[PDB]
């Protein structure tokens, strides 16, 4: 349904 | 064309290892996932967790995305990740990367599936 499409950032 | 969901997996998922093995991890993985083809992709992050744990983050803490959109989610827990960054000498097609292993919270933008 809802899936990751972008890695905006880490910590 | 690959969908945004598939490109997300290609560029960032590495469930095969628990953490970066050696300082040669970025060099190998950037080439392997085809990120050094036309150009040297400057920065990239690999997440060492199951795909299921990464997809679950879309139902975790809602936060603003850096672009101001509101479909970003922050993982509740820290995750094993490896940061790959292009060194200053590195030149296409000789792509050189620094590898940094760390345990951090990831923030992902989520979309329909």
What CATH number does residue B73 fall under? 3.10.130.10
Q: Which residue has the tokens 């960054």?
A: B85
Q: Residues with Cβ < 8 Å from A4, sequence gap 6 or more?
A: B5, B8, B54, B55, B57, B58, B108, B109, B110
Instruction: Say which experimental method was used.
Output: X-ray
Would you call B67 exposed, middle or buried from its count of C-beta atoms within 10 A (0-12, 13-18, 19+)?
exposed
Q: In whole angstroms, what is the distance from residue A7 CA to residue B1 CA?
A: 20
Q: Which residue has the tokens 């995305």?
A: B65
B55 touches A at CB < 8 Å: yes
Total number of domains in chain B: 1
Local structure of B55: helix, strand or coil: helix
Structure tokens at B70: 């509101």
Structure tokens at B27: 């060099």
In this complex, the residue of B8, B12, B113 whose CB is nearest that of residue A1 is B113
Strand order in the sheet with B72-74: A2-10, B106-112, B72-74, B61-63
Annotated binding residue B41: yes
Residue-number span of the structural domain to which B93 is assigned: 1-113
The torsion region of residue B68 among left (phi > 0), alpha (psi -120 to 50) and beta comes to left
Q: In whole angstroms, what is the distance from residue B47 CA to residue B57 CA?
A: 12
* Resolution for this PDB entry, in angstroms: 2.0
Q: In whole angstroms, what is the distance from residue B69 CA to residue B12 CA?
A: 21
In this complex, the residue of A2, A5, A9 whose CB is nearest that of residue B107 is A9
Length of chain A: 11
Cβ of B85: how many Cβ atoms within 10 Å? Answer: 15
Closest residue of A to B4, CA-based?
A5
């Amino acid at each position: 349904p809802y899936v990751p499409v972008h890695l905006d950032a880490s910590v | 064309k690959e969908t945004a969901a598939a490109k997300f997996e290609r560029q960032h998922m590495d469930s095969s290892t628990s953490a970066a093995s050696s300082s040669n991890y970025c060099n190998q993985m950037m080439k392997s996932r085809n990120l050094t083809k036309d150009r040297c992709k400057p920065v990239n992050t690999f997440v060492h967790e199951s795909l299921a744990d990464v997809q679950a983050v879309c139902s975790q803490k809602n936060v603003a995305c850096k672009n101001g959109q509101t479909n970003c989610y922050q993982s509740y827990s820290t995750m094993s990740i490896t940061d790959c960054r292009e060194t200053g000498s590195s030149k296409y097609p000789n792509c050189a990367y620094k590898t940094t292993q760390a345990n951090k919270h990831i923030i992902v933008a989520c979309e329909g599936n």
